[PDB]
Design a protein around this motif. Structure first.
Motif, short mmCIF file in Angstrom:
data_model
loop_
_atom_site.label_atom_id
_atom_site.label_comp_id
_atom_site.label_asym_id
_atom_site.label_seq_id
_atom_site.Cartn_x
_atom_site.Cartn_y
_atom_site.Cartn_z
N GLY A 1 0.81 -1.19 0.00
CA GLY A 1 0.00 0.00 0.00
C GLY A 1 0.85 1.25 0.00
N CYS A 2 0.18 2.37 0.13
CA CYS A 2 0.88 3.63 0.14
C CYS A 2 1.28 4.10 1.52
N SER A 3 2.43 4.76 1.55
CA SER A 3 2.85 5.36 2.81
C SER A 3 1.85 6.36 3.36
N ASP A 4 0.98 6.93 2.54
CA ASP A 4 -0.07 7.82 3.05
C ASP A 4 -0.91 7.12 4.10
N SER A 5 -1.12 5.82 3.92
CA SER A 5 -1.83 5.00 4.91
C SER A 5 -3.05 5.72 5.47
N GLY B 1 -4.26 1.02 -3.92
CA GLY B 1 -4.08 2.45 -4.07
C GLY B 1 -5.21 3.22 -3.40
N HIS B 2 -5.16 4.53 -3.48
CA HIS B 2 -6.21 5.33 -2.89
C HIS B 2 -6.45 6.64 -3.63
N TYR B 3 -7.72 6.97 -3.81
CA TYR B 3 -8.09 8.19 -4.52
C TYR B 3 -7.68 9.38 -3.67
N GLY B 4 -7.05 10.37 -4.31
CA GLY B 4 -6.51 11.49 -3.57
C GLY B 4 -5.07 11.31 -3.13
N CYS B 5 -4.45 10.22 -3.51
CA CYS B 5 -3.05 9.99 -3.19
C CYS B 5 -2.16 11.17 -3.51
N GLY B 6 -1.38 11.59 -2.52
CA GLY B 6 -0.49 12.72 -2.75
C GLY B 6 0.59 12.42 -3.77
N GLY B 7 1.02 11.16 -3.85
CA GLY B 7 2.05 10.80 -4.81
C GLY B 7 1.54 10.86 -6.24
ZN LIG Z 1 -0.84 7.75 -1.38
#
Ligand SMILES: [Zn+2]
Ligand SMILES: [Zn+2]
Ligand SMILES: [Zn+2]
Ligand SMILES: [Zn+2]
Lengths: 212, 212, 212, 212
Positions: free
Chosen positions: B40-44, B96-102
């Motif tokens: 997953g993403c570090s945004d978590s 993944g996730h919608y709005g991901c900063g990356g």
């Molecule tokens: Zn992200």
């Protein structure tokens, strides 16, 4: 648990939040950035949010086998640089765990395949602290290596160009080294906390001394 | 929340578990290996355990900026190889996730520093799907890129030597591509699920087709 | 040739230089830095010094399989950053070669082991240019892919944060894409030469157009 | 020398080979694979072909800053795996050089940018051998560190899964550690030559002992 169970549980959890916590996503929808970066192990035996009470949106997370900060691992360095320079996190926590499969494999050295290359970085730390470990009872050596690994990754993180640059320019970032075990989930602060280049060196030696 | 708060909350949580869930660590103390690897993403933004109901010990986890599986990233590849060959996980989920900063930074292309190199892999995917994205309404393009990113990372994971070897030798491993947003925490299965080399190709094309 | 032959030849060559070229090391002993960085293939079929006449001390060199500049390869990026920021090289030359074993393996896709992961970056370029390659005679496609690979690595190099920063601050650095074959050792300039961010884009398209 | 000079020199050299050495490319056109892999420094102060007399096609080459074999550098590991498993090279030579800018920067520790992260691996070796270096005259310490660096990279190479696997299966591969300086171009064999897992350990200790 199987895959259909995860999807179905997710759908039920999302619906139930309307009654239980309709505001669950409200802070996430705000522009508040996480104040903490957690670097932990892929074992993820107890999730960081459960260990600490941190809420969704408060923690930026990286996980890899045995919670390493290798000097030249661009994956972890990219997480750190984004967290420090873009999100401006105020705290970075490196958390190891007693019983880590990666640390145990470094010591027992089974032939596991590709992962053995990653684990050589832990074997280098084991070599570095051989004399210290030899002064301790054998039954405490593996957990002590788990702690030394965390301390060395904190030291590596503080020596990265990312952290050196941030501290030179007066950005407030503190690095911490922690560990826990599954016997109680209780965090141990390894006492290597660094707020600048000088405390990085002083408290690294302090943490090692506390083990001697 | 501050650091002293995390340590203090952890100590209280550990004590309260004796009454609330004295068996909380019992499965962790058994030799059962996790059956799932989550990339997953570090945004978590919402932790994977909260999204799915997975318990401590059920999930092996890697997180990096924008949930990438870069062909030559030894950090992620080492997590995958240990999970597949040593832990013998049965499912790998890339979420993944919608709005991901990356993903957003890949499209807006601000000058963020070291992280921009990592994000070039997302810009390559954006280029690859330019014609597809051009047939869609502008307001849906960024979230569609988030989904395409997941699908491409699933494709990369299935093309790694680790996965190709596992499937060739008849090990049962299934890869999945998911996404969620913070508007409701509801997982969307992107329908790229792969159980062998053939379904990897078929369902990659299926997932892209579902977007066209 | 065997190992004892190399050591013995080296000793004789060092002694013979006293008469043949007593000044052979004189420029090396001066503080003059190399003006060129060569990024080439580990195949090293004809050494760069032989191809160009460059003398010892004039060339900084990186070589890897199929002369890649992967967006997130810290080995190559570290060579580039040291060359550009510390040595202040004025030219970077990426040189591919017709008949490259890495390019051929990307197309034929044998099961070679770990290296196949590295080669996936070439397969991505092959995919990117499928329509262009389809308009050309089959017998020219493999060498055209060799050229496209060089052009894409030049493009990646120019998009790295290292090069973008250097050009933004007005440092004079030019990037070039070349290829040669062993049929004659004759360098072909692929005409993608970039001196700033704008020419990077313009001449990338020019080089591709020259192939169409 | 400038760019037009390199292109023009190349064209003249290619034409002159018809009279001087019409067979120059004949071995290159045969299917003979290189028997040697050279891992050297990007400084490339004297090219490996000049130092040894090796001809075009006899040497597979990797170069990076200060000739490192980092446990987790997939660029170098991919060169090694292709050389050992696909080309079946019989010898791997790691060659350092006295006066190396990378080794000197590790000791002086200027703030050079991204490259400082790569150089931390050399600082780790310097730390490891502090007591040994302290028993030697100061003026010999920097060159001794250059040699220790080579020996440690040979040790790392022999501990990679690639080399361990090759030796376990009875493939004949020998690793060597060499150094030279620009005062005479004379290779010094550091006497760490390894043909299997046992000699790797024995001769590593031998090479270090020869320094004590
Ligand atoms: Zn992200
Ligand atoms: Zn662990
Ligand atoms: Zn090649
Ligand atoms: Zn050097």
């Amino acid at each position: 648990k199987d895959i259909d169970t995860l999807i179905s549980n997710n759908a039920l959890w999302s619906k139930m939040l309307v009654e239980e916590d309709p505001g669950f996503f409200e802070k996430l929808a705000q522009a508040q950035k996480p104040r903490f970066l957690w670097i932990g192990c892929s074992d993820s035996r107890v999730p960081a949010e459960r260990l600490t009470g941190l809420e969704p949106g408060e923690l930026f997370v990286h996980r890899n086998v045995a919670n390493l900060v290798i000097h030249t691992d661009l994956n972890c360095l990219s997480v750190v640089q984004y967290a420090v320079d873009v999100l401006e996190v105020e705290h970075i926590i490196i958390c190891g765990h007693y019983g880590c499969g990666g640390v145990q494999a470094a010591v027992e050295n089974p032939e596991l395949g590709l992962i053995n290359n990653w684990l050589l970085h832990i074997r280098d730390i084991w070599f570095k602290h051989s004399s210290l470990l030899g002064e301790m009872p054998q039954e405490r050596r593996l957990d002590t290596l788990c702690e030394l690994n965390v301390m060395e990754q904190v030291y590596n993180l503080g020596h990265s160009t990312i952290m050196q640059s941030a501290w030179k320019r007066g950005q407030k970032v503190t690095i911490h080294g922690w560990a826990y075990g599954i016997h109680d989930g209780l965090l141990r602060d390894l006492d290597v906390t660094a707020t600048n280049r000088e405390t990085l060196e002083q408290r690294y030696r302090h943490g090692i001394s506390n083990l001697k």
